[PDB]
């Protein structure tokens, strides 16, 4: 990586919820790359091919590469060492490795109404993260691409504001995100043998017994079903309709497994007693 490094290349990783918010992650990246191309930068914009096919509420990604020099890392699927991490949905700070391989002097841009301090309770160790940015793009767009993109400029200054104001459909919401962004500065690979050893005979793996730990899907959750047991009739309509087998029938009633629950809200929608409520995930620490 010494002979083929690119110091002029900035990597951007934009996390989003699959299907529902993939375009939002895309519009952020495209607007940024188009804005840098007006300054003469060499840019690339694309969606994570690895996350395909995209599923509903699955953590997906959209990457950006901006360089003053011709890009020689085009054929690389993912940005492995991001400089700017962007979240289109707030709950992505919970249970999703959005800080893996971040480079020094990096910035975290999050779309939320919660305080930065509360977010750090979900980030844990911030590592080499230099700055954190919070913007309420939900109210500004009322797309949310421009207010988030505007908040990125305020902290990194990758492209000029006027240049980005010429590529967005809503420049007004962008400037708000550029102005109301809350910035806080923070203090500053396996071998092929093992990669071969981790490959079982013909790819044949044993069947699970109780759960499939190869795919823990709790971090898909934007919202979680909350039960009111005094309103529960124990009809178990919810139990027979969960696509992810997250409900167990007990004497106390239906118990919801939060390790895999994707928060689709099916159980809530079909419940005739209204004993279930969809509540944002960031109201929970577990």
């Amino acid at each position: 990586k010494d002979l083929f490094a690119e110091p002029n290349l900035k990597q951007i990783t934009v996390w989003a919820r699959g299907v529902v918010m993939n375009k939002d992650a895309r519009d952020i990246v495209v607007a940024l790359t188009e804005a840098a191309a007006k300054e003469g930068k060499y840019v690339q914009a694309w969606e994570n091919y690895v996350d395909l096919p995209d599923r509903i509420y699955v953590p997906v990604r959209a990457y950006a590469r901006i360089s003053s020099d011709p890009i020689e890392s085009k054929y690389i699927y993912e940005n492995e060492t991001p400089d700017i991490v962007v979240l289109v949905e707030e709950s992505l700070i919970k249970g999703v490795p959005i800080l893996k391989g971040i480079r020094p002097g990096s910035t975290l841009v999050v779309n939320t109404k919660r305080s930065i301090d509360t977010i750090l309770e979900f980030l844990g160790d911030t590592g080499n993260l230099a700055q954190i940015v919070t913007v309420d793009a939900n109210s500004m767009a009322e797309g949310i691409a421009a207010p988030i993109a505007g908040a990125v400029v305020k902290a990194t200054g990758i492209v000029d504001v006027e240049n980005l104001a010429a590529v967005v459909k809503n420049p007004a919401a962008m400037r708000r995100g550029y102005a109301e962004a809350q910035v806080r500065q923070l203090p500053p690979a396996v071998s092929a043998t093992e990669l071969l050893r981790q490959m079982p005979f013909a790819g044949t793996v044993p069947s699970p017994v109780t759960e499939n730990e190869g795919m823990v899907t709790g971090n898909w959750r934007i919202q979680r079903p909350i039960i009111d047991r005094e309103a529960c009739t124990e009809c178990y309509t919810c139990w027979i309709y969960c696509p992810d087998s997250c409900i167990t029938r007990t004497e106390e009633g239906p118990v919801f497994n939060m390790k895999y629950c994707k928060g689709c809200g099916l159980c809530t929608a079909v419940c005739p007693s209204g004993a279930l409520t969809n509540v944002p995930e960031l109201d929970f620490k577990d």
Binding site: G18, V19, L52, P53, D54, R55, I56, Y57, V58, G203, V205, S207, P208, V209, T210, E211, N212, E213, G214, M215, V216, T217, W220, C235, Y236, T237, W239, I240, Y241, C242, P243, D244, S245, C246, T248, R249, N257, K259, Y260, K262, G263, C264, G265, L266, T268, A269, V270
Partner: protein, 312 residues
């Protein structure tokens, strides 16, 4: 013999489709798989032709099935199943195994049952293998990014059937009714049924009924796709119920030359009350909806749904 399931309260707690798979939030076919595995039991072998219920469930280097499962091509669902059946009946006869004859179930997508896997299906019914062939129908090639299929409804929007000035409806072709295709011409075929995830108990019983038969069975299960049909992830079961209440999907058991309706629809809603909830039909004019309505009416006539449409 797998006993009849009386109710949800009397339905088994045991899951054979555990939590942990990369399927969409509120995935219809995922629930289908969950209900099928629950009704099947431990003595079951699953065959998964390439599609969403293969890719999404096994991603990556794993799987949710507590029972044996093998990948098949999208082209040979029934062909592979035939091999597993032929193998077990021979290994048992030659005393090369003490294993009892298992439930052999194919979980094929609509493309893998109606389009590119149809030939391997028909020939399996002809040979009379003791195999349950199930088609979970999301009315598209979903895993490849939602492309048109023989079960994709008329005028539906796919990446292969986009609406334009030349073709305003996107898809000009009316869907193929595969259950009726294979229901005739196959003497060894003893049990055919159409099911929906809106009716989980009815669904599971039909599976158990097909498995209890000493021959080939075919069950076409309706499984709404929130990602493909473009509707909220928590409206999949409402969509499944609406599909039946509007005549888009018919629940029955065709045995001995006669259709036997599964659910009693006293009154049918117009097709608009089902298609308005899905953005794949969002391009259609009231005239296209009319052609759809006429088609659904005729479709209900074949099986015996004579009730009129309310507020048509």
């Amino acid at each position: 013999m797998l006993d009849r399931i009386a109710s949800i309260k009397k339905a088994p707690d045991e899951e054979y489709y555990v939590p942990g798979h990369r399927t969409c939030a509120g995935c219809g076919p995922a629930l289908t798989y969950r209900l099928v595995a629950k009704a099947a039991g431990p003595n079951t072998i699953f065959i998964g032709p390439t599609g969403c219920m293969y890719v999404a469930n096994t991603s990556y280097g794993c799987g949710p099935w507590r029972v044996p499962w093998i990948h098949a091509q999208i082209t040979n669902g029934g062909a592979v199943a035939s091999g597993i059946e032929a193998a077990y009946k021979a290994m048992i006869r030659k005393k090369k195994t003490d294993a009892e004859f298992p439930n052999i179930i194919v979980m094929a997508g609509d493309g893998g049952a109606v389009d590119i896997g149809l030939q391997a299906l028909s020939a399996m019914l002809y040979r009379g293998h003791d195999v349950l062939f199930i088609c979970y129908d999301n009315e598209s090639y979903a895993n490849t990014g939602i492309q048109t299929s023989p079960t994709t409804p008329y005028g539906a929007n796919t990446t292969f059937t986009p609406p334009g000035e030349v073709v305003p409806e996107g898809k000009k072709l009316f869907p193929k009714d595969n259950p009726k295709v294979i229901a005739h011409g196959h003497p060894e075929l003893k049990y055919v049924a159409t099911a929906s995830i809106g009716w989980p108990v009815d669904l599971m019983n039909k599976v158990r009924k097909g498995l209890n038969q000493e021959g080939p069975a075919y069950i076409h299960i309706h499984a709404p796709c929130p990602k493909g049909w473009q509707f909220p992830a928590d409206k999949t079961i409402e969509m499944a119920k609406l599909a039946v209440q509007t005549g888009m999907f018919q629940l029955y058991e065709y045995e001995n030359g006669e259709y036997k309706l599964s659910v009693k629809v006293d009154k049918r809603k117009p097709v608009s009350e089902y298609m308005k909830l899905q953005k794949r039909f969002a391009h259609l004019k009231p005239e296209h909806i009319a052609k759809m309505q006429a088609f659904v009416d005729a479709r209900c006539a074949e099986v015996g749904i004579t009730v009129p449409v309310v507020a048509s």
